[PDB]
């Protein structure tokens, strides 16, 4: 639906939608920008991620409310409406995964872009896994794991331990282990090793980079406090 708008205008409108907290619009604008076929800059990748994370975040929050009501009940209405929200969530995840697969990931050669997109791929398969129950749930989980794992392998080879993308990837992979793969020990070990190796690299950073890295380290510590 965005094929007739200029790439630069779509990006400008994505930023306006963010200021207006119109995240569905923001996602549609960034989808249109991706479909222009050019690679995305660092700032543009962040706009894409912020837009879809907020859209799917609202859907996940709603799904959890409805799933909780449904479990306390077990007419068809609560199940039907949970299924409606669930289907809408799956459609948004499929859209994001389709953008990554056509063709963001295959054109991403630099570590910062490739790790960013593979983290996204793990995240949106993780969101699919949160609602999955049928014959494909194990494959969905392995798809998340495989994307996260490839991102981890690249990040450990190509990025310092304090790199914010590397830290956020490890944070989310640790949540995957704890919440999805039923591997709380793997989750705790990953969060601990990630925190400790970043701590030992903080001395290399500027004041601004220090703030970026320690902010995400605090989320790792918050989870370790919750889990231990």
């Amino acid at each position: 639906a965005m094929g007739s708008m200029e790439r630069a205008s779509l990006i400008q409108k994505a930023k306006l939608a963010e200021q207006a907290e119109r995240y569905e619009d923001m996602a549609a604008f960034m989808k249109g920008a991706v479909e222009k076929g050019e690679e995305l800059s660092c700032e543009e990748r962040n706009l894409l991620s912020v837009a879809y994370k907020n859209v799917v975040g609202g859907q996940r929050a709603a799904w959890r409310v409805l799933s909780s009501i449904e479990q306390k009940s077990n007419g068809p209405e609560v199940r039907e409406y949970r299924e409606k929200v669930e289907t809408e969530l799956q459609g948004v995840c499929d859209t994001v995964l389709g953008l990554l697969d056509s063709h963001l990931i295959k054109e991403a050669g630099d570590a910062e872009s490739r790790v960013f997109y593979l983290k996204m791929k793990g995240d949106y398969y993780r969101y699919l896994a949160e609602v999955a129950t049928g014959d494909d749930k194990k494959r969905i989980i392995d798809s998340a794991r495989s994307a996260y794992q490839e991102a981890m392998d690249i990040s450990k080879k190509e990025m310092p331990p304090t790199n914010p993308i590397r830290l956020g990837l490890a944070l989310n992979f640790s949540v995957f282990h704890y919440e999805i793969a039923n591997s709380p020990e793997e989750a705790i070990s990953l969060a601990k090793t990630t925190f400790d190796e970043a701590m030992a690299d903080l001395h290399t950073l500027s004041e601004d980079s220090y703030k970026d890295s320690t902010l995400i380290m605090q989320l790792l510590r918050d989870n370790l406090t919750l889990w231990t």
């Binding site: 956020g168 944070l171 989310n172 704890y178 889990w227």
Partner: peptide, 7 residues
Amino acid sequence: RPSSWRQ
């Protein structure tokens, strides 16, 4: 209940 990455 745990925190994934957020702004």
